Design a protein around this nucleic acid. Structure first.
Lengths: 78, 132, 55
RNA sequence: AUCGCUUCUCGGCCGGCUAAGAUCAAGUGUAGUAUCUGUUCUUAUCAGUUUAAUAUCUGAUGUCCUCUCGAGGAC
């Protein structure tokens, strides 16, 4: 479970408000939030690696309460 | 005092300068480099850095041709070098290698000059136009 | 064929490069943590990271 | 309505001539540091030096006998 997939975001969000955002729950050890080079903008889906698995299963339970730019945030195991 | 060994930095900057300014302006290119003159920059272009120069091993034909010609016109390297398509210094080194290994108001007030359009078979009296 | 007979027999009745880099950095060196499954760790930085971990 | 060609219209990517006119700036030394580039260790094990720990450096490849590195026997 150490990693999660996160959908439905707005590009003003970046890797930092994800950092800050999910460490509110529990620390994101490895952050991945693609920067698209071609048009220089984000599609808004994320992958998160944690310290171990327990962090991330609690993360499955609590985790999908985040709302990025008035809008819904997908978090599921991976 | 200016003379010395050529540097990768000086050589790459020489590439870029030659690309930008063009082949015939040497004094401008020597201006950017330090410790090098215009003559040295030109001869350094045409002797070595020039991409048209062929840097590789000599095929068998080029060795036959080089040896034959060098026996034809002894010691003349600047005549032979264009015939084989190589640099004079290069074909020299290769030759010694072969013997070595061989052994004011007109505008904003009043319409500058006016041509009222000419009037033709139709009625322009009525027409007027709106403001901005 | 024998393999098949065997499987049928023992089956549930109901189915569900950086060589000097790792030495320099201190990795790929044999080490062990006793409290964790007598586990093996290949690097000292890594084992120092074991101290904060889920397991 | 479709295909092809054409016309118009719109949108998106989207520096003259001369003798080439003429001419053409670099101080030194004593110490010392930084930053570029290129090249080298899959070595196995043990002993010692050494290190904060590494690293590094330094030494050899169970013993005996017989036969032609291999085989057998005794440990």
């Amino acid at each position: 479970d150490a990693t999660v997939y996160v959908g439905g975001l707005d590009e003003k969000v970046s890797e930092p408000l994800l950092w800050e955002l999910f460490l509110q729950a529990g620390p994101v050890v490895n952050t991945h939030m693609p920067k698209d080079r071609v048009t220089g903008q984000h599609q808004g889906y994320g992958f998160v690696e944690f310290l171990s698995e327990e962090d991330a299963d609690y993360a499955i339970k609590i985790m999908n309460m985040i709302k990025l730019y008035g809008k819904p945030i997908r978090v599921n195991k991976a | 005092i200016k003379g010395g060994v050529w540097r990768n930095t000086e050589d790459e900057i020489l590439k870029a300068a030659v690309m930008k300014y063009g082949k015939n302006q040497w004094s401008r290119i020597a201006s950017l480099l330090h410790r090098k003159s215009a003559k040295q920059c030109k001869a350094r272009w045409y002797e070595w850095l020039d991409p048209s120069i062929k840097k590789t091993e000599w095929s068998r034909e080029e060795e036959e041709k080089l040896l034959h010609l060098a026996k034809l016109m002894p010691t003349q390297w600047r005549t032979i070098a264009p015939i084989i398509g190589r640099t004079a210094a290069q074909c020299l080194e290769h030759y010694e290698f072969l013997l070595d290994k061989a052994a004011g108001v007109d505008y904003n007030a009043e319409i500058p000059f006016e041509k009222k359009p000419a009037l033709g078979f139709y009625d322009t009296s009525e027409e007027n136009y709106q403001a901005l | 064929e024998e393999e098949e007979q065997i499987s049928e027999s023992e089956s549930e009745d109901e189915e569900n490069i950086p060589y000097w880099l790792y030495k320099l950095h201190g990795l790929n060196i044999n080490y062990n943590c006793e409290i964790c499954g007598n586990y093996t760790y290949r690097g000292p930085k890594a084992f120092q990271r074991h101290f904060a971990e889920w397991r």
